[PDB]
Amino acid sequence: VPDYHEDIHTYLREMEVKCKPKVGYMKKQPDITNSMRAILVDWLVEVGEEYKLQNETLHLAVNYIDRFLSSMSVLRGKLQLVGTAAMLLASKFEEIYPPEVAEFVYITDDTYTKKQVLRMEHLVLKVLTFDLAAPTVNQFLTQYFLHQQPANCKVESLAMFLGELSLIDADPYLKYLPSVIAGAAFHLALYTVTGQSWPESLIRKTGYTLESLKPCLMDLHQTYLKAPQHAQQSIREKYKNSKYHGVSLLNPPETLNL
Amino acid sequence: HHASPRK
């Protein structure tokens, strides 16, 4: 059923910009850092494994958090509350059966109260002016997947892995937009497992070429290389499971020849 | 007259 795909794509290429956080917002943040953020993204990942939430849910959350800190000053004792308030939402947005609020208080181990979570819900909704349907790296990959020749489930997983690694590192990944990171991942995966590259078809679909993906393709690879030594690891532990064809165990290529 | 499925 490829009748709307392109209108969709386009609207998402347009929306992504309107839902993109401001790059160096952390710079203006007095108390929190990229590091605390990483600690927060990495745990949200754990959160969604415990409750089996779709990856879309995690992505929608990170996006919510960023945009929000983008314009709000938050102390470290609360960042978690922001974080948790976003996972609720994202859930009520994308899941069939979103975890109930009481469950969310429990995973914070009572750090915040139910009422404290609900209020933050209201607040996040105010700051985001309910603009909740954001395009994510996942909506892009999933479309790029249609151009495989043929479909290789190893690549799919490994791409998801890559695009998921970028969720943890504000710096540098706030620089790129969802569609570009997804290309970066989609290409990396492909090369690593089958050795093919950003196909001619996708070049026509998005306008992006391997050369345009270099800058992000240079950070991504590096992020891959250093995956095992990174502070946060929930995502690797995650991509060990068989549901993901252990792609996190595969050895990345040494060079991209770009 | 059936209503709308609910959640």
């Binding site: 059923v1 859930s91 609020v101 349907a133 | -």
Partner: protein, 296 residues
């Protein structure tokens, strides 16, 4: 809220009532939907969360307009543009008259206009039906009630099953498939389309299996040729009576050759072959459409 003045309750759905209201400052007449919170529950209803946002990105002449959202501490009022009445009430007043072919044609075209928009913005309505569509005294119709909608992706994942009001639910849902998509909204439009034509619900079933039997008896029990896969669907029973498709002139007498063709194409069994709003908007049926004003 200081500025709105409640007039008469227009409807009343799930999380609350619905008033026709006027703004004391600017005179604008609006529609206010009071979604309850209670709080100490789950905060904002995930259904209100979708309606608002998905509607934040659906600005179109054929889609009801969300004016504002007043997210107080006790309730949540969605403020809407105010239209005259829904297609159900209007269809009732035409209980004897029958809606004139041109007016109808105008109607469907618009609906399809709005429908393809949504689809082009990755949103499934999932609850198309006459009482959920509003017309104005000017010959315009508009989609409404996004309460049950969801943003979709590509390609799609399994979504919520309990979806669409019974009479207007597609066969892929009735038979329990793993995946459904845009085509479900068309099946609905198709039924609505037929309904404008005879002022009685095309397939008014009183149950999942009766709905299914009603469809079968009119379109002929689906087999592997017409819809490759049916006999492997979860709720498909090989014991289904096998009826033979009926002549569209006996189903839709008034429709001419074109309107016939479109309709049939809107109710194809195989969702992958069902006409799309974009392709619909272009059927020869609409080559001469105009914009008639409704009788009121």
């Amino acid at each position: 809220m200081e500025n709105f003045q409640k007039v008469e309750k227009i409807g009343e759905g799930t999380y609350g009532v619905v008033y026709k209201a006027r703004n004391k400052l600017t005179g604008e007449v609006v529609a206010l939907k009071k979604i309850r919170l209670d709080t100490e529950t789950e905060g904002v209803p995930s259904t209100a969360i979708r309606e608002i946002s998905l509607l934040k990105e659906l600005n179109h002449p054929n889609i009801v307009k969300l004016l504002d959202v007043i997210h107080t501490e006790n309730k949540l009022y969605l403020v809407f543009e105010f239209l005259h009445q829904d297609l159900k009430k209007f269809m009732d007043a035409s209980a004897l008259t029958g809606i004139p072919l041109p007016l109808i044609k105008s109607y469907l075209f618009q609906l399809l206009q709005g429908l393809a928009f949504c689809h082009s913005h990755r949103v499934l309505h999932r609850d198309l039906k006459p009482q959920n569509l509003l017309i104005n005294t000017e010959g315009a119709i508009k989609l409404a009630d996004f309460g049950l909608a969801r943003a979709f992706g590509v390609p799609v994942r399994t979504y919520t099953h309990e979806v669409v009001t019974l009479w207007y639910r597609a066969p892929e849902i009735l038979l329990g498939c793993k995946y459904y998509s845009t085509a479900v909204d068309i099946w609905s439009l198709g039924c609505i389309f037929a309904e404008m034509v005879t002022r009685r619900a095309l397939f008014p079933g009183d149950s999942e299996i009766d709905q299914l039997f009603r469809i079968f008896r009119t379109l002929g029990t689906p087999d592997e040729v017409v819809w490759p896969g049916v006999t492997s669907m979860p709720d498909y029973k090989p014991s289904f009576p096998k009826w033979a498709r009926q002549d569209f002139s006996k189903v839709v007498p008034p429709l001419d050759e074109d309107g016939r063709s479109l309709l049939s194409q809107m109710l194809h069994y195989d969702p992958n072959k069902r006409i799309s709003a974009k392709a619909a908007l272009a059927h020869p049926f609409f080559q001469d459409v105009t914009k008639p004003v409704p009788h009121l």
